[PDB]
Swiss-Prot record:
This is Serine protease 1. Its cofactor is Ca(2+). The gene is PRSS1. One of its GO terms (cellular component) is extracellular space. Synthesized in the acinar cells of the pancreas. Subsequent cleavage after Lys-125 leads to alpha-trypsin. Further cleavage after Lys-170 yields pseudotrypsin. A cleavage may also occur after Arg-99. It is an enzyme of class 3 (hydrolase). The active site is at H40, D84, S177. GO terms for biological process: digestion; proteolysis. Residues 1-221 form the Peptidase S1 domain.
Length: 223
């Protein structure tokens, strides 16, 4: 997250870190057994880390649970990033409490102008590299479809939305991949892509979660 703020420990209780020896992606806990992330975060040997603030220090509220299965969306295209969404099932159920909690799926899609919270352990620099230990947060509005398409001609599908600031300076970034965009207490987006980070007229692009609620529910119901 570039141009954000320190969230505060366990203040984003649905935020997970995906770890394969090191943090490599975020994700969102959606029930005691399942995490939503980006398809571009797929790899084998994932350990889901819940209750994290400082990802380098065991602070006492963590739960570390290995994935039993990952399910990349059947229509994910890694070239275009269309349908950039994955489900990860935990080998055992997380213990839910104030600091480890699931986030609601949307009942309807969120409109341009809606204020959201984006979070992660990604790069905090737009030129250069600095990776934080503690969770970073950014408040950002959803942008209009027309402005999103103007920023990224030929690249925005019906399964994507832009959020952030056309002026630059505030954005998600590398390492935030797969993490949440939460608006009015609903998971509306997944950190997906963008050209660089926090660049003028190059806002963040996010997977449009509301398009996937049926798939998520029926996948969970049978897996
Ligand atoms: C992998 C990646 C690329 C760009 C952005 C962004 N500028 N929002 C975020 C990301 F997670
Ligand atoms: Ca920790």
């Amino acid at each position: 997250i570039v141009g954000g703020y320190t969230c505060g420990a366990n203040t984003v209780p649905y935020q997970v870190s995906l770890n394969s020896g090191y943090h490599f992606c975020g994700g969102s806990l959606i029930n005691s057994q399942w995490v939503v992330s980006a398809a571009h975060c797929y790899k084998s040997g994932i350990q889901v880390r819940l209750g994290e603030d400082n990802i380098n220090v065991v602070e006492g509220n963590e739960q570390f649970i290995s994935a039993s299965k990952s399910i990349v969306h059947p229509s994910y295209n890694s070239n275009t990033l269309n349908n950039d969404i994955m489900l990860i099932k935990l080998k055992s159920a997380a213990s839910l409490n104030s600091r480890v909690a699931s986030i609601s799926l949307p009942t309807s899609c969120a409109s341009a102008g809606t204020q959201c919270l984006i979070s992660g352990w990604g790069n905090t620099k737009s030129s250069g590299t600095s990776y934080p230990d503690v969770l970073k947060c950014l408040k950002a509005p959803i942008l209009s479809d027309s402005s999103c398409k103007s920023a990224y001609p030929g690249q925005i599908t019906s399964n994507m939305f832009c959020a952030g600031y056309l002026e630059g300076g505030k954005d998600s970034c590398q390492g935030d991949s797969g993490g949440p965009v939460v608006c009015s207490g609903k998971l509306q987006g997944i950190v997906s892509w963008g050209s660089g980070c926090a660049q003028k007229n190059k806002p963040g692009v996010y997977t449009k979660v509301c398009n996937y609620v049926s798939w998520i529910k029926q996948t969970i119901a049978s897996n």
